[PDB]
Amino acid sequence: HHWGYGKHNGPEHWHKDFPIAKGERQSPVDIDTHTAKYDPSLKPLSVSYDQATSLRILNNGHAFNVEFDDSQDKAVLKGGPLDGTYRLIQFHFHWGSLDGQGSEHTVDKKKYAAELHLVHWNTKYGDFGKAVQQPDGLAVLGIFLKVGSAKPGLQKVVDVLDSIKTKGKSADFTNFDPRGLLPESLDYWTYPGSLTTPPLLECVTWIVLKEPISVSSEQVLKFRKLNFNGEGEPEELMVDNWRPAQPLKNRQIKASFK
Numbered sequence: 001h002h003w004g005y006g007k008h009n010g011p012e013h014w015h016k017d018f019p020i021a022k023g024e025r026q027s028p029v030d031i032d033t034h035t036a037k038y039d040p041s042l043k044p045l046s047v048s049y050d051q052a053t054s055l056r057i058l059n060n061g062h063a064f065n066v067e068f069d070d071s072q073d074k075a076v077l078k079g080g081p082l083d084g085t086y087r088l089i090q091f092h093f094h095w096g097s098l099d100g101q102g103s104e105h106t107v108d109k110k111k112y113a114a115e116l117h118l119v120h121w122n123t124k125y126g127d128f129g130k131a132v133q134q135p136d137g138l139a140v141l142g143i144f145l146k147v148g149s150a151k152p153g154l155q156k157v158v159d160v161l162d163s164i165k166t167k168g169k170s171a172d173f174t175n176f177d178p179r180g181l182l183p184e185s186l187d188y189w190t191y192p193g194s195l196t197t198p199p200l201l202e203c204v205t206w207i208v209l210k211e212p213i214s215v216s217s218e219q220v221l222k223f224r225k226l227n228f229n230g231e232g233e234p235e236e237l238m239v240d241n242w243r244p245a246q247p248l249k250n251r252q253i254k255a256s257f258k
């Protein structure tokens with residue numbers, strides 16, 4: 001009875017195997033824009049993906065991961081609310097079955113069609129494994145996706161999805177530049193949270209961009225053709241792989257802008 005997004009193994013069931021699901025700093029959360037406060041102590045955010053080197057794309061049965069070679073000091077996120085340097089390890093998305101839903105974080109209760117998560121680990125911890133055992137081990141840059149004009153830089157990802165339709169399939173995915181997935185503005189909201197999928201570890205400093213990127217209906221429709229199941233198994237479309245907003249509890253969301 002492996003965790004998932006269905007009626008019998010979805011978000012409402014996760015707490016049984018992962019008690020931290022009802023923790024003190026769980027994600028995602030609704031971002032109440034009027035309650036968020038501009039933070040003057042936030043330093044300029046720095047996204048340096050010029051030397052990013054992708055290796056492979058994988059369908060893990062929950063989403064698809066574009067993995068990067070993080071053995072060297074490349075693709076770094078720093079500044080903003082972060083102390084030190086965080087290295088990019090992979091990115092993935094969460095999306096819906098319809099354009100009206102799909103994002104994990106919400107803005108004033110508004111749900112976007114999807115949400116991109118660029119995952120980075122704190123280099124002071126050596127690697128990802130050790131980093132997820134620390135309260136400041138990860139930094140995730142979240143970017144909302146709305147349906148409208150196509151995002152040229154996303155097409156290469158879209159076109160390779162037909163080769164990793166089912167759970168367990170992977171394909172070489174080199175030379176992909178994640179800079180093509182970033183919106184113009186780096187204005188953001190930040191708060192301490194967790195991974196949004198089991199084990200739901202609370203090691204994430206969230207940096208959610210205010211400006212969404214636009215992707216075409218055709219592009220997101222191809223996301224929805226992926227499968228949760230493995231090859232040779234009954235088809236269950238990979239849609240609505242998002243966790244709903246969780247209690248903000250003892251937290252404050254800070255804004256990088258006025």
Ligand SMILES: CONS(=O)(=O)c1ccccc1
Nearest residue numbers: 117119140194195196197198
């Ligand atoms: C950031 O939340 N996205 S997640 O699906 O929980 C995830 C976190 C870290 C590595 C892979 C997936």
Ligand SMILES: [Zn+2]
Nearest residue numbers: 092094117196
């Ligand atoms: Zn995610």
